[PDB]
Each structure stands twice: as C-alpha cells, then as structure tokens.
C-alpha cells in the first residue's frame, strides 16, 4: 500500500479487539501503576520523554534511582 | 390479522433484534421473554456466555458499541428503561441504566466513534433521548419531547463524510432528519412519502461518496431509498424500491456495495441492489 504512517493505526486496533509500545509507535500512568519488566517500563519512560505527567515521570526516575 | 399468526406458528424461535459485535466475534440477541443473550460464533458454531435478564418488558432492539471504548453493548425495551452492558475479564455487569422515557423504547443506535460515544433511542412516547459519554459513570442526557406524533420506532445515525444529522421514523409516517446548533438538536427537516407508520430507517454508509442514501420501511408495505444529490442542498428526493401487499418490518444496508436487505412481507428476506440503470433489482430470495 502507497506509503503513509498507517501501520501504527492498524496494529492499535488489532491490540484493542483482542500493545502499550504498539501505541505509542494517563494510560501510561495506569500502566506504571499495573507495573508498581523493568526495561519494558524503561522503554516506556523514554516514551514518554519522547512525548514531552511530568510528575510522574520524575517519580518513574526515582523509582529507577 | 389474528387469522395469518396461527397459520404456520413454528416459532423455532421467536426473537426480535440480533447483532454481531464489531470484529465479528460475538452475536448479540434479544427475544420477548426479556432476556439479552450474548453468543460466540468462533467458526461458524453459536455458543452461549451471558444471559443479560433485566428488562420488565420484551427487548427491541440491540447494539454493540465501538471496541475503541472496551466491550460495550446497549439494549432497549417495552419496560421504558434502556441498559447498557460493560464488560471487565468477563465481567458483564451494567455500569449504566436509562429511564427518562415514559413509554416503550423501539430502538437504539450507537453515533459513528468519532462523535465519542453517544447513544440515541427513541421511545414510544413520541420523544428520543440521547445518553453522552463523559470521564466516569456520569451520563448527561440531551432529551427531544414531542419528536414524532404518535411515538418514534427507528434511529439511525449517518456515516460521518462539525455537524451530525439523524435520521429517523416513526409512526406519523414522517421520516425526521435532525441536526444539532448550540448544544440541542433541531428537526432539519421532515419527510413524508409513507402512507402509514414508519417501521425502520437505515442511513446507508457512505463509501467515501459524498452521495448520502437513506432507507425506510412502513406498514403500507412500501420500501423508500431517499437521495440527496449534493453536500449541503436540502433536497431529499425519495424513491420507490418496490411495495409487497404486506408491511415491512426492517431495513439494513451492506457495506460494500450498497445492498438492501429488505425484512418483511411473508417471513422472508430479499437483497436488493440498484442496477447500472438506476432502478433497484431483487438479487436473490434468502432461506
């Protein structure tokens, strides 16, 4: 198919019928909370440093202190 | 009347509105002993996980909200209150319940997930009453009293091609479309052409075509495909797809293509789709 960020589009929906990083290529929040591995929420906080909650960022960062 | 019931009887079994769920998954079902069963048909096999009982009357219609909001499904009644069912790891509890209506409730619709998720059903009373999705469990209702004379059987809502226009039928025969200003909806227009009670109204999706259809049914027995012809010019021309000597109960549009899916008459279902001439031809008889 003629180029254009759709894969993105289509692979979050499939996520939602039946992720997070699929997503991404307060949710987050919820997710660090499920999450209370590690280089997964890594990868989320680069993210999410991508993103920019700020907040809680800088809780995620003294978490990984 | 009573004489063309007892003829045949075979039940086998009664049932009103069944839905497939998004994905094409599930299979939503609702009959008059007041309970909403939800099925499964994973290849082809029906199998039963829920069923939702709570109506204090038979259930009408049925439909699946957008997976985009988790796993949502709404039913409406004969007892004046409309539920909807969440669910959470099969979980299927009702995190919401409706009773704004003072008469029955014929049928329900979900707004195109783009709007968010904005329900519209209309009651027998005359009057359709709209549920909005805000953070929680809070839901505001924008309610319309005296939309049809003598109460309201079908809602449809429009593919979205910013504004929102409703379509929908009832019993003064007049097919209403709505629109919305400030905040409240306003009756862009009426369309009168049915003889009789309106039975349903489907507003066709639109295939990116910006040529908007509409379809509806009634007790005369006459099937209605109304044009507008351009964007943003208020002519609804209506067309005759054909008339059966008996009424008919439901109208449903196929994605693709643009096929009519023509229930009622004499217990059987036809297809229809508008040939290269413009005129509308019966492809096939179902069962």
């Given amino acids: 198919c003629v180029p254009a960020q759709w894969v993105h589009e289509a692979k979050a929906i499939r996520s939602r019928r039946d992720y997070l990083l699929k997503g991404h290529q307060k949710l987050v929040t919820r997710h660090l909370a499920?999450?209370?591995?590690?280089?997964?929420?890594?990868?989320?906080?680069?993210?999410?440093?991508?993103?920019?909650?700020?907040?809680?960022?800088?809780?995620?960062?003294?978490?990984?202190? | 009347?009573?004489?063309?019931?007892?003829?045949?009887?075979?039940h086998e079994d009664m049932i009103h509105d069944a839905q497939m769920d998004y994905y094409g998954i599930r299979l939503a079902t609702c009959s008059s002993d007041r309970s909403v069963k939800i099925f499964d048909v994973k290849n082809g096999g029906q199998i039963l996980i829920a069923d939702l009982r709570g109506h204090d009357g038979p259930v009408w219609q049925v439909a699946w909200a957008h997976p985009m909001y988790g796993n949502i499904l709404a039913s409406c009644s004969y007892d004046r209150k409309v539920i909807i069912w969440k669910e959470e790891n099969g979980?299927?509890?009702?995190?919401?319940?409706?009773?704004?209506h003072d008469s029955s409730v014929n049928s329900v619709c979900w707004a195109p997930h783009d709007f968010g998720l904005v329900?519209?059903?209309?009651?027998?009373?005359?009057?359709?009453?709209?549920?909005?999705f805000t953070g929680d469990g809070p839901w505001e209702v924008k309610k319309i009293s005296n939309a049809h004379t003598i109460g309201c059987n079908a809602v449809s809502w429009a593919p979205?091609?910013?504004?929102?226009?409703?379509?929908?039928?009832?019993?003064?025969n007049l097919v209403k479309i709505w629109?919305?200003?400030?905040?409240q909806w306003k009756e862009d227009q009426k369309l009168e052409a049915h003889s009789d009670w309106v039975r349903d109204v489907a507003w066709a999706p639109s295939i990116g075509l910006p040529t908007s259809t509409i379809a509806s049914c009634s007790q005369?027995?006459?099937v209605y495909i109304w044009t507008s012809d351009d964007a943003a010019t208020?002519?609804?021309?209506?067309?005759?797809?054909?008339?059966?000597?008996?009424?008919?109960?439901?109208?449903?549009?196929?994605?693709?293509?643009?096929?009519?899916?023509?229930?009622?008459?004499?217990?059987?279902?036809?297809?229809?789709?508008?040939?290269?001439?413009?005129?509308?031809?019966?492809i096939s008889d179902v069962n």
């Fill in chain 1, 34 to 65: 499920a999450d209370a591995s590690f280089l997964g929420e890594l990868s989320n906080p680069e993210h999410c440093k991508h993103i920019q909650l700020d907040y809680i960022r800088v809780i995620d960062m003294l978490n990984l202190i």
């Fill in chain 2, 1 to 10: 009347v009573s004489v063309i019931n007892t003829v045949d009887t075979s």
């Fill in chain 2, 91 to 100: 979980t299927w509890e009702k995190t919401y319940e409706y009773t704004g």
């Fill in chain 2, 119 to 132: 329900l519209a059903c209309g009651s027998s009373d005359g009057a359709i009453s709209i549920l909005t």
């Fill in chain 2, 160 to 172: 979205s091609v910013y504004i929102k226009r409703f379509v929908s039928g009832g019993c003064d």
């Fill in chain 2, 179 to 183: 629109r919305e200003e400030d905040g």
């Fill in chain 2, 220 to 222: 005369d027995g006459r």
């Fill in chain 2, 234 to 282: 208020n002519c609804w021309t209506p067309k005759l797809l054909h008339k059966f000597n008996d009424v008919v109960w439901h109208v449903s549009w196929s994605i693709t293509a643009n096929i009519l899916a023509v229930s009622g008459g004499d217990n059987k279902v036809t297809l229809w789709k508008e040939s290269v001439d413009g005129q509308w031809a019966c």
